[PDB]
């Protein structure tokens, strides 16, 4: 390909990209809820 | 009776030190949860959604009955039994039988779990002779494997991978799952040695 | 890979349900009710197809067929596992009753009686067994429960669409 | 991972028992007789549709733009008469377009006859002054109500 098609190919590659869905904020939210339940239930 | 003995030890300890400590409650939580009745109820609620007239469901029924009897005898460990159970559940024949029982409307799964409780009473698959009916009541009135429309607990380990792919959004598309060590800041105590799970947060 | 990429379009509602797991049919003039379902579905890590009915080539066939599946003419509408979930009053009800996990992931709603939102500590039966002869009201010395608090005045909200 | 498989575990148990110095559990022989379940090794007729499409497209233009007649009543009888005259001409098998021409000429004559009898009945109902249609009764029951709403304000 030439320069124009290569630039449009990398533009379409950066535009339509599949990210890595790593459930980190739900893990931390479950940990936060568990810590709140432990702090509520036990002194 | 070791559970009543541990309850007696818990009462004597809580009367001795005059507070509810962490050691004694952990001890009686470990004693009251040593039973393998959970996996037997898994196998029997998988047997309940089957068809007593179909020969394929008779094969699945006898396979799961032998599996539950081998678990209750202690001759087979829990992990290989879970492998056998999830291999029997993920088959398309069992899923097609469960779909037919859903499409029926007058399903025979309630009589199935009732006869399952009677079998667990008769064959000695429980700890108390009348605990299977309370466990049946617990399976009915709560969210459990008995209220699932296919007859297994709804985790993604008991569902097929080709159905797991278009629904869930996992790490990469198109086994034991781990966090790769490129994340130097994931959480406070999260790291590469912390495993992740597709359809549940066990934390 | 083997086929060039092409945007999916259909004049029938049945081809959208049989293709995607979670389909949502929105309008561009309703951004708040669309973005609330975007927050709920992406929280459970579920793949979702959002169909904007603004600038579509089959608006009048799709507006008729969405009136037959859901009797209310309110958009957006969530469709999971070839079934009708409903509007924001139906999605937030499953989130409140803790049913939105098994609806989005496994395509069924729990028919278990009783509410799981009002729980304290561990979830057990705790008096859920049926009492003999009824008459739970006539014993006036019963355990009423812990005292609850209620606000005297309504505090000002952060946003009108915060909730 | 296929290294933890019920068939692989059954094979491992079988070659463990086959030494003669290991005693089999009951589930080994009970799984030889009941093996684990495997996942492997498993309206309208279209010519009548085209005919009704052609006849509807050619009748809509003669009824809407041609005759300028929108209050036509009971169109199903002249349309089915068009269908049955088309089948009558297709019995002898004359042509295709000329049968449509004669069918549309008969339909135009029928629409003219229906328009003329409607005009004759309307003219005789308006000349004598004794007979009133239901639309006129609805419109006077509406306009007397509106005059009473003018009286109310």
- HEC-encoded secondary structure of chain B: CHHHHHHHHHHHHHHHHCCCCCHHHHHHHHHCCCCCHHHHHHHHHHHCCCCCCCHHHHHHHHHHHHHHHHHHHCCCCHHHHHHHHHHHHCCHHHHHHHHHHHHHCCCCHHHHHHHHHHHHHHCCCCCCCCHHHHHHHHHHHCCCCCCCCCCCCCCHHHCCHHHHHHHECCCCCCCCEECCCCCCCCCCCCCCCCEECCCCCCC
The two tokens of residue B31 are 């004693």
Any CB–CB contact under 8 A between C43 and chain A? yes
Q: Report which secondary-structure segment, H or E, holds C80.
A: strand C77-80
Q: Residue C117: which of C93, C91, C148, C151 has the closest Cα? A: C93
Q: Residue C63: which of B53, C54, C8 has the closest Cα? A: C54
Q: Give me the residues of B, 145-184, that contact D with CB < 8 A.
A: 175
Q: How far, in Å, CA of C152 to CA of B81, rounded?
A: 58
Contact C121 A41 (CB under 8 A): yes
Resolution (angstroms) stands at 3.1
Q: Which residues of D touch B93 (CB under 8 A)?
A: 37, 42
Contact B187 A28 (CB under 8 A): yes
Q: How far, in Å, CA of B173 to CA of C63, rounded?
A: 34
Q: Sign of the C-alpha dihedral, residues C119, C123, C126, C131?
A: positive
By what technique were these coordinates determined?
cryo-EM
Q: CA of A41 to nearest chain C CA: how many angstroms apart? A: 7
Any CB–CB contact under 8 A between C45 and chain A? yes
Cβ count near B70 (within 10 Å): 22
């Amino acid at each position: 390909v030439n320069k124009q098609t290569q630039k449009y190919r990398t533009k379409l590659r950066y535009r339509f990209r599949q990210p890595s869905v790593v459930p980190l904020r739900q893990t931390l939210q479950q940990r936060h809820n568990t810590i709140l339940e432990v702090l509520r239930r036990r002194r | 009776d070791t559970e009543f003995q541990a309850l007696v030890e818990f009462i004597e300890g809580a009367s001795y030190d005059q507070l509810i400590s962490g050691r004694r409650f952990k001890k009686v939580y470990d004693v009251l949860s040593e039973n393998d009745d959970m996996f037997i109820w898994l196998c029997h609620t998988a047997m309940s959604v089957l068809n007593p007239g179909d020969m394929r469901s008779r094969l699945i029924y006898n396979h799961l009955r032998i599996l539950a009897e081998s678990v209750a005898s202690g001759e087979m460990t829990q992990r290989t039994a879970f492998r056998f159970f999830e291999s029997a559940v993920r088959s398309p024949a069992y899923r097609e039988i469960a779909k037919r029982q859903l499409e029926g409307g007058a399903a025979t799964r309630l009589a199935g779990i009732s006869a399952a409780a009677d079998v667990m009473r008769r064959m000695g698959l429980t700890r108390r002779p009348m605990s299977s009916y309370f466990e049946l009541y617990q399976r009915i009135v709560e969210r459990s494997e008995a209220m699932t429309p296919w007859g297994f607990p709804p985790l993604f380990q008991f569902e097929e991978r080709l159905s797991l792919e278009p629904r869930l959004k996992f790490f990469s598309r198109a086994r034991i799952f781990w966090i790769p060590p490129t994340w130097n800041r994931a959480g406070r105590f999260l790291g590469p040695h912390v495993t992740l799970y597709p359809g549940m947060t066990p934390d | 890979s083997a086929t060039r990429w092409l945007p999916f379009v259909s004049s029938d509602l049945k081809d959208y349900l049989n293709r995607y797991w979670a389909v949502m049919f929105t309008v561009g003039a309703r951004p708040i009710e669309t973005g609330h379902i975007r927050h709920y579905v992406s929280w459970y890590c579920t793949r979702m197809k959002v169909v904007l009915l603004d600038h579509h080539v089959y608006v009048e066939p799709l507006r008729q067929q969405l009136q037959e599946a859901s009797r209310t003419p309110e958009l957006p509408l969530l469709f999971v596992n070839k079934k009708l979930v409903g509007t924001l009053r139906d999605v937030e009800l499953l989130e409140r009753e803790k049913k939105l996990k098994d609806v989005l992931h496994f395509g069924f709603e729990w028919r278990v009686g009783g509410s799981v939102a009002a729980t304290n500590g561990q979830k057990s039966l705790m008096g859920a067994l049926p009492a003999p002869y009824g008459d739970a009201e006539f014993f006036r010395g019963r355990y009423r429960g812990p005292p609850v608090a209620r606000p005297v005045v309504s505090l000002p909200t952060l946003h009108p669409f915060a909730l | 991972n296929e290294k933890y498989e019920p068939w692989e575990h059954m094979k491992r148990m079988g070659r463990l028992v086959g030494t003669g110095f290991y005693i089999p559990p009951e589930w080994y022989n009970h799984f030889r007789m009941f093996p684990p379940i495997n996942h492997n090794f498993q309206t309208l007729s279209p010519e009548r549709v085209a005919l009704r499409d052609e006849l509807a497209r050619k009748s809509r233009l003669v009824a809407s733009e041609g005759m300028r007649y929108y209050n036509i009543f009971w169109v199903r009888k002249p349309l089915d008469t068009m269908e049955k005259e088309y089948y009558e001409l297709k019995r002898r098998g004359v042509d295709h377009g000329e049968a449509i021409r004669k069918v549309l000429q008969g339909f135009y004559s029928g629409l003219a006859v229906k328009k003329r009898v409607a005009a004759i009945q309307a003219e005789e109902a308006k000349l004598t002054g004794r007979f009133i249609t239901m639309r006129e009764a609805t419109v006077v029951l509406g306009v007397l109500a509106k005059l009473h709403k003018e009286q109310l304000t």
